[PDB]
Structure formats: C-alpha cells, structure tokens
Amino acid sequence: IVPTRELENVFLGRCKDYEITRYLDILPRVRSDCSALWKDFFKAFSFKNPCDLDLGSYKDFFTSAQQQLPKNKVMFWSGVYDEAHDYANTGRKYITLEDTLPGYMLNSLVWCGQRANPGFNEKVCPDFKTCPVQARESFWGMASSSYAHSAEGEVTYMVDGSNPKVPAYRPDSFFGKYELPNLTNKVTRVKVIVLHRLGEKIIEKCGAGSLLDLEKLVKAKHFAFDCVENPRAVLFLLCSDNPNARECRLA
Amino acid sequence: IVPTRELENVFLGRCKDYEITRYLDILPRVRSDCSALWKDFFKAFSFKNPCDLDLGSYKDFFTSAQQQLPKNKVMFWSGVYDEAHDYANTGRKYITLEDTLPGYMLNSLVWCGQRANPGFNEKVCPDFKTCPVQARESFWGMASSSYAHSAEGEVTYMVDGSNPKVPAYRPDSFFGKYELPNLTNKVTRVKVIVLHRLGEKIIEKCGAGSLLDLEKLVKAKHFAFDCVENPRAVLFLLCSDNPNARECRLA
Ligand SMILES: Nc1ncnc2c1ncn2[C@@H]1O[C@H](COP(=O)(O)OP(=O)(O)OC[C@H]2OC[C@H](F)[C@@H]2O)[C@@H](O)[C@H]1O
Ligand SMILES: Nc1ncnc2c1ncn2[C@@H]1O[C@H](COP(=O)(O)OP(=O)(O)OC[C@H]2OC[C@H](F)[C@@H]2O)[C@@H](O)[C@H]1O
C-alpha cells in the first residue's frame, strides 16, 4: 500500500487553496497559517514507527485546525459515503467532516512515520489493520471526535438500511465510537435518514433492530429524535442514477 | 472588484493538488510541472494594462496545460452551471471544462495585469465589461477553444429552455463563440439536453426556435444530432431540490 507522493507539498497546497477560496461563506477561516498547521501535523507521527500512535497523537493539530461549525448543519454518515456527500452538496445543504479544513486537506491521503530519517516513509505503509486499534484510528478517530464535539443545534445522520452484514447502527462504527458519544449539550436533536437502496432487499427500519437501539441511546443523551426512510429529496438522488428501478415510476 | 489574494500561491497549490490527487483515473496528467505552468500563466498578462490582452495572450499556457480528453465524455453547457455540473458528477458521468487542469486551477479566481511592479494588481481589477471583447474573454475564450478543440467522439450540450430573455442557443454564448465552431472531425455527434425548470414556463423545445437553428448548424458540420427534453436522469436531479413540483409526482 503506497504512500501519497510529496506529502508535505500536497498538504500545504490543499491548505492554501482552502484558506483562500473554499467554503468561504460556509465555514470560518482557521487561525493557524499553513506551515504552523503542518508543523503540528508532522510532529504527531514523524520519527516513530507507523504503529506507534494513539488517540492523542494529533491532539495539537486538531486543536489548531478546528473550525466552529454552522448551527444545525452538521451531518454524519455510515456506509453511505457517496450518497451522503451528494445529498450534503459541498456545504450547501449539510456539512460533512470532509468539508472542514482537516478533512479536506487529508482526504484520501496515505502516510506513516518511520524512525529513520526523514521521519516518514516514502516507499510503503503497513495495512494499519496490522496495528493496534488506537494507532489504526489515531487520525480519523480524533478527527471525528473534534468534529462531533464542535457540533451545535440539530444534527443529521445518514445510514445504510440495506445491508445484511453491517447493521444501520453499530456501536463500533466511527459514528458510534467517536461521533455520537462526543456530542455536547449544545446539540438539540438527531434527525436520522435511512437509505434504502433501490432494487435491493430492505433490512433495517425506524423503530426496529439497531435503530430501535440508537433511538434509545439518543433519548438517554437528552436529545430529540426523528427518523425517516428514503425521504423524497434523497429518493430522487438515487433514482437519478438508476431511473428504472421499480421505486422510481412517475404518476 | 477585488483580485484573488496570493494568486501565485493558490495557483501553485491548486496545481499540485490536481497533479497528484484529482481525476487520476479520469484525465491524464499534464506534462509541464507547476512553475513551468505558472511561468506561462504569468507571462500572458503581467506588466501590461488589464485591458491589453487578446485571444493569443494565453496561447502558450493552454499549450502546456492541455490534456487529451476521454472519447464521448466531453460536455458543454450554457446557462445551467449548477445542473450541468451535478449531472456530470465530478467527471464520473461527463467531463466539464472545470474538471480539466486549467479550468480547475483558475476556476473562480480574479486577477489582472498592471504595468508597474510587480506586474499585477493586488488592490483592484476593472470590471472586465469595460475592456474590449478580446481582452474580456482572453482567458476563458481561449480556454473554451482549446477544450472544444480537444474533444473526440460524442459530445453533449446542456441548455436552459426556460428563459424568455436568453434563448437556448445563441451564437454569441461561449458555446456558440468558442466551443461549437472549434469541434474537429474526430467528433461524431452532438447530444443536446434541454432543461425545463420545474414550476416555470416552458420556452424552447426540440426542433423549434434556436434549437432548430442549432440543429441545422450542427448538420452542416457533418455531425449527427439528437435532442431530448428533461430526460429522467436529469429530471430526478431537479426534483431532488424541489420534490413537490407538479412534475415530480410518484406513480
Ligand atoms: N475518519 C474518518 N471519517 C470518515 N470516514 C472514514 C474515516 N476513516 C475511515 N473512513 C471511511 O469510513 C468507513 C468506516 O465506517 P463507515 O464510514 O461505514 O462509517 P463510520 O461511522 O465508521 O465512519 C464515518 C463517520 O465518522 C466520521 C464521518 F463524518 C462519519 O459520520 C471506511 O470504509 C472508510 O472509507
Ligand atoms: N456558477 C458559475 N461559476 C463560474 N462561472 C459561471 C457560472 N455561471 C456562469 N458562469 C460563466 O458565465 C459565462 C456565460 O456562461 P453561460 O452559462 O451563459 O453559457 P456559455 O455557453 O456562455 O459558456 C459556458 C460554456 O463555455 C465553457 C463551457 F464549456 C460551457 O459549455 C460562462 O463562460 C461561464 O463560465
């Protein structure tokens, strides 16, 4: 598994591009400059083994890179990357973690530390499914925590209700692991959206299975709660890509 | 009207980002590296009056930055930015000019030359509707040329059929000015999509008004031709944002 080339340069460019042109009316600017940000990013992991990370290792970075988030516009998701991001619409409808400075810079990149100069490895990185969990999930876990923690108002969660193997809510998804338990008293409610892929067997439903569990969980947190399956706005997205599925017929 | 801060740095960062992470399986990489590209970009307009540009001013730069384009996947649009780009889905379904390197680096930026050091203006740029047409359209017109020119196979064109003021096809839209007339013999056909916004009065149709004109024009070019109005795929898109409009009712 191959590390991202010229990591430092890509990091600093994405960062500059963002600072100056992206989500301008949508997210506030961060306060550290780019080489400030990088410094902290690099320190987290450099000069150690790949597997020598825990959940505190990028604490400082996410401290500098955190942005306050628009009221009611935070979204979360599980097993629906494409559809959740299509529906969120680059910040226009909702904010996803991928829209925030740190999510945007780091999205899709592969890196790791090595003890020998230059402190990081340009040939290879280990699966990470070979590392302890706290390493494996050092970065994106802390990312999700910082994210979830700075959410205010209403939040929305999109899930996949068409999976026999993976339930809609699972307490060891990133959502259940780092996102849900980190929400603060500033959050008032959790709107849930259950995606039911077209053509494919329906598995989870509001008020049953895991979603019954999540419901209870959320209520305990002193949050409101609602849940809907394939609301029209979402339904049409799906259909857009599959306009013949039996679910898409016109009046 | 305010020029983009730190132009150079944004350009170079957007450029590195693309070079290394964007459209990897969709567009080929460019050959010039980034400060090569920037040199040609800068040369084109620096140390001259904003108003001192013609159509050849960024010829070199688009020579360097041009990429060969997927067969049949090239799209054009007029007056439907949002909808066309949604439908194109970041290159997955079609390629828009905005997905190419040059389009991507420069998208949305504001800059202009000045004669006194440092060559360009960091306070203000005149409202280009004060310049001769060839200046006003120096950059994006050339950009559309080089793009249109590099198209092969089938091409698609999306138009707005719901506008009393602006007809669906106009010979002075960038499409009719730089794109259409620059299509080469490698192109075989033009698929046209007429958007009919929901709730709003229908104006143009296939085989009438400017679309009759465009049709004939396209036939003279020895290209095939078809045209549809709100195909389902597109229809659901619109509907996604406006799920109550009469047009959107379910069986
Ligand atoms: N740091 C990360 N952030 C987002 N996605 C990630 C991250 N790391 C890996 N992934 C992908 O997510 C899958 C892991 O499970 P999943 O995506 O099916 O659902 P989870 O609740 O587990 O994570 C997504 C939530 O956490 C934060 C977001 F804002 C969502 O609300 C893997 O296959 C990866 O493609
Ligand atoms: N949201 C936006 N973001 C950035 N620029 C925009 C936006 N909306 C309009 N514009 C600009 O407003 C001017 C008038 O656009 P038009 O829509 O009248 O169609 P044209 O055929 O003249 O030009 C679009 C075609 O040319 C090159 C492509 F391949 C299309 O097939 C355009 O140059 C747009 O860049």
Curated annotation (Swiss-Prot), chains A, B:
Catalyzed chemical reaction(s): NAD(+) = cyclic ADP-beta-D-ribose + nicotinamide + H(+); nicotinate + NADP(+) = nicotinate-adenine dinucleotide phosphate + nicotinamide; 2'-phospho-cyclic ADP-ribose + nicotinate = nicotinate-adenine dinucleotide phosphate
InterPro entries: ADP-ribosyl_cyclase
EC number: 3.2.2.-, 2.4.99.20
PTM statement from Swiss-Prot or TrEMBL: Has different isoforms which may be the result of different amounts of phosphorylation.
SUPFAM superfamilies to which the protein is assigned, alphabetical: N-(deoxy)ribosyltransferase-like
Domain of life: Eukaryota
Record has Secreted as a keyword: no
Record GO terms (molecular function): NAD+ nucleosidase activity, cyclic ADP-ribose generating; phosphorus-oxygen lyase activity; transferase activity
GO BP annotations, alphabetical order: positive regulation of B cell proliferation; single fertilization
Recorded effect of pH on activity: Optimum pH for NAADP(+) production is 5.0 from either 2'-phospho-cyclic ADP-ribose or NADP(+), activity is much higher at pH 5.0 than 7.4.
Mechanisms controlling activity: Activity is presumably regulated by its sequestration in vesicles before egg fertilization. After fertilization and upon NADase release, it could then be regulated via its potential phosphorylation sites.
Single GO cellular component term: cytoplasmic vesicle
Disulfide-linked positions: 15-34, 51-131, 112-125, 206-227, 239-248
UniProt keyword terms in alphabetical order: Calcium, Cytoplasmic vesicle, Disulfide bond, Fertilization, Hydrolase, NAD, NADP, Phosphoprotein, Signal, Transferase
Tissue spec: Immature occoyctes. Oocytes.
Cited function: Synthesizes cyclic ADP-ribose (cADPR), a second messenger for calcium mobilization from endoplasmic reticulum; ADP-ribose is a minor product. Synthesizes the Ca(2+) mobilizer nicotinate-adenine dinucleotide phosphate from 2'-phospho-cADPR and nicotinic acid as well as from NADP(+) and nicotinic acid; with NADP(+) as substrate preferentially catalyzes NADP(+) hydrolysis rather than NAADP(+) synthesis, about 70-fold better at pH 7.4. Has cADPR hydrolase activity at very high enzyme concentrations, which is probably not physiological.
Entry's family note: Belongs to the ADP-ribosyl cyclase family.
Protein name (record): ADP-ribosyl cyclase/cyclic ADP-ribose hydrolase
Protein's organism: Aplysia californica (California sea hare)
